[model samples]
Target: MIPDVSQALAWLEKHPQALKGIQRGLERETLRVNADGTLATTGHPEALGSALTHKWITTDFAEALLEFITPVDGDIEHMLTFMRDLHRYTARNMGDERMWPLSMPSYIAEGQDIELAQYGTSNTGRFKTLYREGLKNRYGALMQTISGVHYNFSLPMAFWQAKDISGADAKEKISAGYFRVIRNYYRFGWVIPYLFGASPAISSSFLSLPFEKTGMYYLPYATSLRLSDLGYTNKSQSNLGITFNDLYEYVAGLKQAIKTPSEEYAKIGIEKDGKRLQINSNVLQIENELYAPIRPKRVTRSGESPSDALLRGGIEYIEVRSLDINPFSPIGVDEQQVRFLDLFMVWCALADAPEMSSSELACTRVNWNRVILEGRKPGLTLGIGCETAQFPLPQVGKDLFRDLKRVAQTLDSINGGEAYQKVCDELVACFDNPDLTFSARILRSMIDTGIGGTGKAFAEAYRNLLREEPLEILREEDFVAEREASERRQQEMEAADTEPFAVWLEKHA
Candidate 1:
């Protein structure tokens, strides 16, 4: 049976510390972003791209769900603080010209230029090489690659329901809706081409590509989108690297541009005055028609009819794409922060999100505008349908605190109180007065220490701290053994035998 919201909460309560292991691993390898927003490590052919790839940090969802709904004291506030720290650290180091391919073209050679690497494929060779070499020569071999510079890796967490999709059957439909929303939601006209272009087309195409006759599309969940190690370059004396804060501002500006109907919509071919469509049968039909030309299909042998590909259904997950890789950390993340993300995702899932109406959609667009443009400013409020008062940053923190308490209580009930409560305390302490949070502290530290006055120094200090710590001190020997076992499995795959495709083809002929 599919779990309801309460059931999901219950599951999280039981496994309060389930994600701790993953979080710990990430902390050791965290890629620190400094105060002025620069990476500690530097000088690689694809440093920006490599940093982007390390953004995929996984969580113990099975455990978190078990603990969240139970009567347990999950440290939800700590989790949020950790996440804030991660975001702040990442934002501080943000710099990469090649982060968004849709917005700009890849650097080209003189003749027969090849396209940039898609999300998945051999074409990712350049990125893979950079990641591996960067780990070995720069960080260390223990660090693994999670994602690379492909799409605009923006991680926005929120909930919205469609008019027609609900219950278990609606999973695939909902996923498709989100897929379309992300695909069509233009920040600028650049993303469409960047995602669809031949070089970087793997992500969408691979999922949509037909495989079996039963429409069994393989959807890999929890994929990473890394955007780090970006720097400025001069093309004919023009400055290029977009910083983290600048990127956020750019997104905000884009949101503002979209608010009013003008030449921008015309440029993107979206009619400004058109009515927003509902997600009913009519909408489904329209989707079929609109996407049919591009949809993947399977061809039968000889004169058989073609069939649709598979569709994996579930809630759509958005990994944040703009974190700067910390040069000091081994894996580019930490445990406390990972725990925070687990709670944050749960908070978003449980937040008071209503099904979007046309007007509501407009509000959401506006809210996104505020987030990107004036996220750091005081008295910045967002519109939520009925001209509600803007939620102050501190208020937002407090609201999150309430949600965390609820989640923590659920965790305690499920007998996972000890682990989760610890996490919660850490988070709450970070925001004790709202003025002590990581983002706030980072700014304060930058100003107080006069750490070179550039964001780069802040990033450097964070990385240095990670380097000084013993990243992994395993309590359970089994976990260590498991790592060794996994290494063996990897080796086996590397040395496995292969069949001759040409010979097999000849036999079939």
Candidate 2:
């Protein structure tokens, strides 16, 4: 069922340098847990600096949830080393709290045990935390704390020029091209979880519903529960009708989704007893609330929404949000995963992708859900194109990898290493033997020692590794200067505040 990109492949073969400067950045989120494997209730560490202004390090939904954002880089190894240094610095400074290495949170009695991330006295900062508060009211804090790696990627301008996709309306052409790739990604991106889905099991305490006597809840054949029905991929916004056809349509769809009212959320009420409970009673608080496995993005200008940013500058980069935290790695991502994503993005852009409507796009989720929940099951079959056809998972995976090998070889030719080709050869075997997938291997360990126990062991091991490994890309002074500067920036914003939070919230809303 793979798209025929032979023509594009031939074109790429003739112009190998077009693939050389792929830009990538990584955002990895992990919860800081106690040494005993419970969510840390303490405030965001001071040594890590202000969450409001820190460029690289910040907190997400919870104070304990640490998000490390790497600067965009052309070199994959440099990006990975930067990620590692972020972990190493935090590991050394964050006291006894260990970064929960898994996508799922550590065992907790209930959601309230986790503290909301604080952003000091600035109106901008308060608004951020309030948006999170609204999220907790809509969804539980437990769900909000679930972490993952968001991979930011963009093809170099040279690649677009190579394909002769440039002009005065270059931004428009570039955006349209990205949507094409996005459509293909929606169809075939399920392979990501199948290969790197490390969150196969979750601690039993996190479950609000009843299950068996086991201390951990899991399906033996499941890939990423983090992407499954039990996790962030819930049915809450299934009827939102957001389309991925093009930039204008996508932005318009997000705007409509934000304004669309939901009766269920309305019951929660906007302001309860003079305290703001949510941004609004709409289907979404903002465009960012529309959860998708992939998103078309542009860096936003001050006071501009994500949709506005895309409309202003077109799609600068696409964020791949399907990756579960690889618990084995201290940085929660590895070079092989980076190499695979690069090859896959190139393939997505080169492959022929037909325009799909919202209804047609919804059909792809069926395949993704299947792969997310029970991907490694023997003889698992996936529907292609609204059940137009069916293929065995292994067959489809192998077919895709065959094309990937060709792209990988071309990449290796210009990149001056066999790393891309080597990764392809290694991952292709995961299709032949499902047990080789990350989920299967980690699940086996979880079953033996319990999920929490296994995670604790990995956490301790990773912490030791981070401590022992020397900083590769960043120096100690680099972090110290950033920490101090971020704190100062937060103070400056707070001092510059002209209006109260309520006034500021009203204007923004």
Candidate 3:
């Protein structure tokens, strides 16, 4: 099903600098747990700054789940260094709390123990908290704490100009190009989890399903159980039929989701007693709630929604959200993984992708779901689109890598190093030998030591490693400045509120 990109690669050869300034940003999420491996009952650390206002640090669904962000930059090392420093800074300040080292959390006996993230009392902050409440109500607290990495990427305008995409409609053309990339990603993104998926096993407490004799819930050949139906995804979202054919179609799908009411959600009620249980009875509280592996994104203005931003300025970038936390890396992600993403994204952009109907897009997920459940299973085959024939996952994986290698060579030539090519060469071997995949490697540890034991050991090791490593791109003073400024910003937001939260909530809805 993979289309040839030789012509595009030829175009790329003529304009060597087109790929010079590809920008990337990373968002990593991990839970802060006690030394004993129980979820940290403590509130967000004061030293980490206000989670609601901090630029680089924040909380996800729960207060214990720490999310670290890096600014958009062209340098891979700088992005990774900044991510490490964020972990180091948090390590020093979080006291005895340790970062969970895997995508699937350690033993969580009951959902009630997981605390919802408390953003201060500002209407905006409360609105954020209420959204999480809705998620907890809909998906259960255990799934909400399951963390992963989000890779945001975009090509420099020079690449578009090199392709003769310019002028007044340049933004629209760029958006369409990204949709092409998204379509290809949906078709072939299963390769991502096959190679980088890290959660093959999980603690027994999170599921009602049967477990092995070892007391862990697992699949022998599962690549990423976190991406399966057991984790962040649910039946409600599956019916939305969101497709990525183009920006308008994508935006329309998201808007329809927010406006569409769910009978199941309606049963929960919007409010109980004096407290609000959710933002509304809609399928999603907002566009952000749509859980897709990838998304078309444009940074929104203060008063603008995500849909509004896209309609106003078109898609600026696409966010890849399929990554599971890498327990081997102290920061939960590594340079090689980022480099592979660079090659994969470029390959997706260069490939000749046809527009897929909603059903065709749905078919892509069947393959993804297969990979998520049993990717490394020997002799496993996957369906491409609506095709009747099945292809061996390994054979398809190796075939895709052949094109990726060519793209990597082009990138290496311009970058004056073998980093890109080196990454491609290393990862391609995983298809030939599945045991080298992250899921296989980590699965052995979880099976041997038990999920909790493995998690705590990695957590202890990562905490010490982070503490020992000094800051690279950021200083202690910089964190202090951000903490003070963020706290002040939260106060300003609270002070700026002129209306009651009730009125604001009504207007916002």
Candidate 4:
């Protein structure tokens, strides 16, 4: 439920500059598979330079699984333009491989052959590799390869400073504000999948983990299986009852998860045959291992953890991790999607958010899972948070967008354009018109040409697009210098190391 936003609107009107400074960073992960659609076994290209040290390009769970990061920027156009150039740069270096354009990947090589991402011999690099190894050991490597995009967002200090909300610390006040937004995101974030979710169907080879009441890998009405119970979730994390009430409690929950041991993972063991299999037997090897749809984050120093950064300097930005890569878009995301998120996130911050009890949180999950799995089901009814009363999903979606419309209007007033409202109006129809949703559209495409066929076609299309475009925002020399810089950074760290990795691991454990 949105708060009465009269005061927030008045504040926005007074401080037009506040709305002028939204910043975004992007991280998109895709598997580089061969033309036949099998996963690539080749090491990440040397042209891309040390995955461990590269500032822009890095490997996520597997070596061939490329993750591209864009520098934080205020200009949405430039951000997208740079993302285009990153894809372009990678395409040239990818050899015979092409980037998979979908969120859910089809079948490939055996799980063991999917190499865990490698860093050089430095303890820090080795630690990064082992953490991912732990992930592969705990979750199937295939599941880990199911890639998506992360959108990092932040409202500038000027925005919060303009809010005139009182707290002992500005960072704490902003952190609390972010938690308010985060809680609301949990409640209403299903709209994202409803409108933009593209993974309605997947190849049969994906893990058929216990998706509620469904044994078939692909669901007819599913939106994003990548965000549903079938994806990265597990028993340990689901039951943690983590609360987003505030920074202290949130950090405490993460710390407890890291310290708690898991019986099943303990059985996997930390080391075997004198090699590290995982970083630890704990429920989480580190705070980063605790997966959440969103995270309050701060940039960390050399030896700082995510939670440590949060505690040290409150949230710098919140990472939105629920997005499935939009297969229809060449860049994995589009301007319309970004505008919608900005509108929704602003609404979340302005909305009246009360901390939820564990039961309330669980109920929110029920609402979200229903939408993710069956949102497009005809005449589907959704309860208002476990209440006996219910309304049709379309009605609920329309109600939220009405609020978002107002939020978009406020944003547009400052920018002197109808761009935000234009997106809001176009997307608002998706609720009443199921055919307008990305899932339905992509599902239809797959129906015409099988999911694998559709994905491969799009992959080739993206490759050709990237290949044909002259670099717009990125230059050859920039990547060349970056590659050299990253390699040097890795070598320096390796040479400066003073302790055995075994000893370094103990310090963290």
By summed lDDT, the worst window of 10 consecutive residues in model 4 runs over 208-217
Error of 4 at 292 (Å): 0.7
Cα lDDT of model 1 by residue, 275-394, tens digit = 211111111111111211012222234322122111222323333222222222222333444444445444444432333333443343343333332233456554433466455544
Across 292-366, the per-residue lDDT of candidate 4 in tens digits comes to 788788999877888898888887898998899999887798889888989888878877788977667777777
Error of 2 at 145 (Å): 1.3
> In model 3, where do residues sit more than 4 Å from their true spots?
208-213, 235-238
Q: What is the lDDT of residue 326 in candidate 4?
A: 90
lDDT of each: 0.29, 0.85, 0.87, 0.83
TM-score of each: 0.38, 0.97, 0.97, 0.95
Model 4 alpha-carbon drift over 4 Å, by segment: 1-15, 109-112, 164-167, 208-216, 233-238
lDDT computed for candidate 4 = 0.83
User: Which candidate wins on lDDT?
Assistant: 3
Q: In angstroms, how far off is 43's CA in candidate 4?
A: 1.3
Q: Rate residue 507 of model 4 by lDDT.
A: 92
Off by over 4 Å in 2: 164-167, 208-213, 233-239
True-vs-predicted CA distance for residue 395, candidate 4, Å = 1.7
lDDT of 2 by residue, 84-186 (tens): 9989988999888888878876577664656888999899898898888888888877888888999999998988887755455789888988888899998
Residue 447's lDDT within candidate 1 is 36
**Cα TM-score of candidate 4:** 0.95
Q: Using TM-score as the measure, name the better of candidate 2 and candidate 3.
A: 3
Models, CA RMSD each? 18.2, 1.8, 1.5, 2.4
